[PDB]
Enzyme design. Structure first.
Site, PDB file in Angstrom:
ATOM      1  CG  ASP A 160      23.905 -13.341 -11.489  1.00 15.47           C
ATOM      2  OD1 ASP A 160      25.099 -13.318 -11.832  1.00 15.47           O
ATOM      3  OD2 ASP A 160      23.504 -13.974 -10.494  1.00 15.47           O
ATOM      4  CG  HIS A 188      25.560 -15.281  -7.796  1.00 11.71           C
ATOM      5  ND1 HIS A 188      25.391 -14.419  -8.863  1.00 11.71           N
ATOM      6  CD2 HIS A 188      26.767 -14.968  -7.249  1.00 11.71           C
ATOM      7  CE1 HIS A 188      26.459 -13.634  -8.963  1.00 11.71           C
ATOM      8  NE2 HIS A 188      27.312 -13.952  -8.005  1.00 11.71           N
TER       9      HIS A 188
HETATM   10  N1  LIG Z   1      26.838 -10.812  -7.150  1.00 15.62           N
HETATM   11  C1  LIG Z   1      27.325 -11.319  -5.932  1.00 15.62           C
HETATM   12  O1  LIG Z   1      26.593 -11.957  -5.154  1.00 15.62           O
HETATM   13  C2  LIG Z   1      28.810 -11.010  -5.733  1.00 15.62           C
HETATM   14  C3  LIG Z   1      29.537 -10.283  -6.636  1.00 15.62           C
HETATM   15  C4  LIG Z   1      30.871 -10.033  -6.416  1.00 15.62           C
HETATM   16  C5  LIG Z   1      31.503 -10.566  -5.282  1.00 15.62           C
HETATM   17  N2  LIG Z   1      30.763 -11.315  -4.386  1.00 15.62           N
HETATM   18  C6  LIG Z   1      31.349 -11.926  -3.195  1.00 15.62           C
HETATM   19  O2  LIG Z   1      31.306 -10.803  -2.141  1.00 15.62           O
HETATM   20  C7  LIG Z   1      32.265 -11.115  -1.199  1.00 15.62           C
HETATM   21  C8  LIG Z   1      33.183  -9.921  -0.909  1.00 15.62           C
HETATM   22  O3  LIG Z   1      33.958  -9.651  -2.040  1.00 15.62           O
HETATM   23  P1  LIG Z   1      35.052  -8.456  -1.876  1.00 15.62           P
HETATM   24  O4  LIG Z   1      35.660  -8.276  -3.215  1.00 15.62           O
HETATM   25  O5  LIG Z   1      34.457  -7.254  -1.187  1.00 15.62           O
HETATM   26  O6  LIG Z   1      36.164  -9.202  -0.961  1.00 15.62           O
HETATM   27  P2  LIG Z   1      37.188  -8.510   0.089  1.00 15.62           P
HETATM   28  O7  LIG Z   1      38.156  -9.584   0.506  1.00 15.62           O
HETATM   29  O8  LIG Z   1      37.721  -7.201  -0.493  1.00 15.62           O
HETATM   30  O9  LIG Z   1      36.224  -8.132   1.343  1.00 15.62           O
HETATM   31  C9  LIG Z   1      35.723  -9.115   2.190  1.00 15.62           C
HETATM   32  C10 LIG Z   1      35.809  -8.499   3.584  1.00 15.62           C
HETATM   33  O10 LIG Z   1      35.054  -9.558   4.454  1.00 15.62           O
HETATM   34  C11 LIG Z   1      35.642  -9.451   5.661  1.00 15.62           C
HETATM   35  N3  LIG Z   1      35.436 -10.671   6.472  1.00 15.62           N
HETATM   36  C12 LIG Z   1      35.954 -11.914   6.556  1.00 15.62           C
HETATM   37  N4  LIG Z   1      35.316 -12.557   7.512  1.00 15.62           N
HETATM   38  C13 LIG Z   1      34.368 -11.760   8.039  1.00 15.62           C
HETATM   39  C14 LIG Z   1      33.515 -11.966   9.105  1.00 15.62           C
HETATM   40  N5  LIG Z   1      33.403 -13.177   9.910  1.00 15.62           N
HETATM   41  N6  LIG Z   1      32.673 -10.974   9.418  1.00 15.62           N
HETATM   42  C15 LIG Z   1      32.681  -9.785   8.745  1.00 15.62           C
HETATM   43  N7  LIG Z   1      33.580  -9.595   7.769  1.00 15.62           N
HETATM   44  C16 LIG Z   1      34.430 -10.570   7.395  1.00 15.62           C
HETATM   45  C17 LIG Z   1      37.149  -9.406   5.281  1.00 15.62           C
HETATM   46  O11 LIG Z   1      38.053  -9.108   6.310  1.00 15.62           O
HETATM   47  C18 LIG Z   1      37.094  -8.403   4.118  1.00 15.62           C
HETATM   48  O12 LIG Z   1      37.357  -7.040   4.607  1.00 15.62           O
HETATM   49  C19 LIG Z   1      33.035 -12.348  -1.714  1.00 15.62           C
HETATM   50  O13 LIG Z   1      32.595 -13.559  -1.201  1.00 15.62           O
HETATM   51  C20 LIG Z   1      32.708 -12.169  -3.216  1.00 15.62           C
HETATM   52  O14 LIG Z   1      33.002 -13.405  -3.996  1.00 15.62           O
HETATM   53  C21 LIG Z   1      29.451 -11.524  -4.613  1.00 15.62           C
END
Ligand SMILES: NC(=O)c1ccc[n+]([C@@H]2O[C@H](COP(=O)([O-])OP(=O)(O)OC[C@H]3O[C@@H](n4cnc5c(N)ncnc54)[C@H](O)[C@@H]3O)[C@@H](O)[C@H]2O)c1
Ligand SMILES: NC(=O)c1ccc[n+]([C@@H]2O[C@H](COP(=O)([O-])OP(=O)(O)OC[C@H]3O[C@@H](n4cnc5c(N)ncnc54)[C@H](O)[C@@H]3O)[C@@H](O)[C@H]2O)c1
Lengths: 332, 331
Positions: A160, A188
């Site tokens: 952000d 966030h």
């Molecule tokens: N600025 C921020 O804080 C920000 C920005 C963008 C995305 N995000 C969030 O980051 C996260 C990941 O996004 P992404 O696009 O990489 O999603 P993604 O689905 O590509 O990756 C998430 C991964 O987490 C793994 N997973 C699920 N449960 C788990 C567990 N118990 N232990 C370890 N790994 C586990 C999944 O299998 C997957 O490989 C989401 O929650 C997303 O909304 C945060």
């Protein structure tokens, strides 16, 4: 050049952000060009093959700073000995959803992994929660890991913050390297307050306030704020996946500034454990302006808070309380 | 310095592009003190995603990044660039014959050669990543005769880095201790990953890989097969071909080319052959090189044994077969 490596955990490592983040860590972008690293990558069993594929690519890149890669679905193994833990594990939102909409799927991850980190991470491990809802996942982690020092748990509002910097750079047509000291207050989510009252732009005739150069307080107090608040949804609309390159880069910035320190004259936004500063309730994970030195954050005290800012800061605090209570309802 | 370097990435809305542009913006390709401007080129079906990549580059607040052009117009993309990393292309998918992958990709390189030759900055350095890498680069060179021949190359640095990684893993030593493998020939399963001139730093000095491994059976057999088949192994594991490691190796290729290879080290680059090593002239073929002053120089005179000679010749013949297939696609 250090001889002792830093052990860095990335959970969610087989996903979009993990894939963008691990090479940045291996190349030295998170902890410096002179700091060797060992990566621990944690995912879940359905992703075991893809996770091993990510490890194979890290090996294939021949990163000279990289001194080991543990790639596992065992949280005890993943958390053992780690000095930095970047928690990305969890489901992303789909187009049209809010960041809170992955709470039910994700908060149980943070309850469980809090215990693994508490029992197995290195004593002074620094924790950064990225997975959404970021502040509430970090708060659940803190509450289920009471022996982790409260100062060592944070969540990512640095994307952000960087988005706000980028919007000012684009509006003024100046390099983003010249823009500093925006603040993201609170959650966030769409209740965040992207505040430019204290932001500066370096010019040929000195540092100038952002408002003085933009000459459009209406934009800064309106469309600018909604643009920053809604930016993640705009990325998902464009790409059909939420903001992995920029989330990974911003997580590198968050850890780097925390560990190596903020530059003189700059502050950055971090979601941290509130202590009563700025009349925000203590005991939340809440984004504040901070400086960092000696590995610790310090809230920037003494900033003037007007009544509009006060109201926005209080509304986002109230949303964080509501999200925490709903998170507990989602847990067994 | 001060003035930014202009870097073109074609295919910028795809998997490798997405992994590569933040590495460039972070200074990994041209140095931590070198500002950059990105030109990103893709095609109209990917325009919305490409705009999303630009939005994220802005959102990351990269201090070295001084501008981002996102376009589907090849002339606009190529105008004034000093480095061009060509990732645009179509990766092979189940059901695609070898001729189908050739035809869909080499036509891009015929077309974009004219835009680069006419609009890029003088002395622009070109790296072709898209597969078939060597043949795409040869087609580009042949259709851009006014680009100096030594300024066109293709990516075998991922093959090279894979071979370093395999030796590191086999010995369980840090990869920073391993250097000077060689990838000869084609970015394909006919490549020759050669360890005869490779070294590992040990507590008792630099030692030849063969002396430490003491397993010629592995080095001449499964090691070679593993490097030749590694791209296919990544696809089996991830259901997509390499991207994190391709982007990182493209950074290494450009960085060593522009900033120079490290002391004592040589690296593999697909470059325009001149007859060295009794390899046919006029191909894009991977050689061991050092780099200084922005130019590569083949490491000459390394001893070539009979087994190595045969492997070097087989991969040259495969490159000649690919060139003939490319030509048959271009009429
Ligand atoms: N600025 C921020 O804080 C920000 C920005 C963008 C995305 N995000 C969030 O980051 C996260 C990941 O996004 P992404 O696009 O990489 O999603 P993604 O689905 O590509 O990756 C998430 C991964 O987490 C793994 N997973 C699920 N449960 C788990 C567990 N118990 N232990 C370890 N790994 C586990 C999944 O299998 C997957 O490989 C989401 O929650 C997303 O909304 C945060
Ligand atoms: N070591 C190597 O040399 C190496 C390694 C891995 C992959 N590759 C090859 O790199 C290429 C890209 O792989 P990827 O996984 O990023 O595939 P991808 O399909 O995700 O990306 C390719 C992108 O190229 C773009 N494209 C097609 N035609 C174009 C044109 N005329 N101009 C500009 N862009 C164009 C596409 O729209 C797409 O966005 C493939 O050819 C792949 O086989 C090479």
């Amino acid at each position: 050049m250090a001889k002792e490596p830093v052990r860095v955990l990335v959970t969610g490592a087989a996903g979009q952000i993990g894939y963008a983040l691990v090479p940045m860590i291996a190349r030295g972008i998170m902890l410096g060009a002179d700091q060797p690293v060992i990566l621990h990558m944690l995912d879940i069993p359905p992703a075991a093959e893809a996770l091993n594929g990510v490890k194979m690519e890290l090996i294939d890149a021949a990163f000279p700073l990289l001194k080991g890669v543990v790639a596992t679905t065992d949280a005890v193994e993943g958390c053992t000995g780690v000095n930095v833990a970047v928690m990305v594990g969890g489901f992303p939102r789909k187009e049209g959803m809010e960041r809170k909409d992955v709470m039910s799927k994700n908060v149980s991850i943070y309850k469980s992994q809090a215990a693994a980190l508490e029992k197995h991470a290195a004593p002074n491990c620094k924790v950064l929660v990225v997975a959404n809802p970021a502040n509430t996942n970090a708060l659940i982690l803190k509450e289920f890991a009471p022996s982790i020092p409260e100062k060592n748990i944070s969540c990512l509002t640095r994307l952000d913050h960087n988005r706000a910097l980028g919007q000012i750079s684009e509006r003024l047509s100046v390099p983003v390297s010249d823009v500093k000291n925006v603040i993201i207050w609170g959650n966030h989510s769409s209740s965040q307050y992207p505040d430019v009252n204290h932001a500066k732009v370096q010019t040929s005739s000195g540092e100038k306030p952002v408002r003085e150069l933009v000459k459009d307080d209406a934009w800064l107090d309106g469309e600018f704020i909604s643009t920053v608040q809604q930016r993640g949804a705009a990325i998902i609309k464009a790409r059909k996946l939420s903001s992995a390159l920029s989330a990974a880069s911003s997580a590198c910035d968050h850890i780097r500034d925390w560990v190596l320190g903020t530059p003189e004259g700059t502050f950055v936004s971090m979601g941290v454990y509130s202590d009563g500063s700025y009349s925000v309730p203590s005991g939340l994970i809440y984004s504040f302006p901070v400086t960092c030195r000696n590995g610790d954050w310090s809230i920037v005290q003494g900033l003037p808070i007007d009544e509009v800012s006060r109201k926005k800061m209080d509304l986002t605090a109230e949303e964080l309380k509501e999200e925490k209570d709903l998170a507990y309802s989602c847990l067994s």
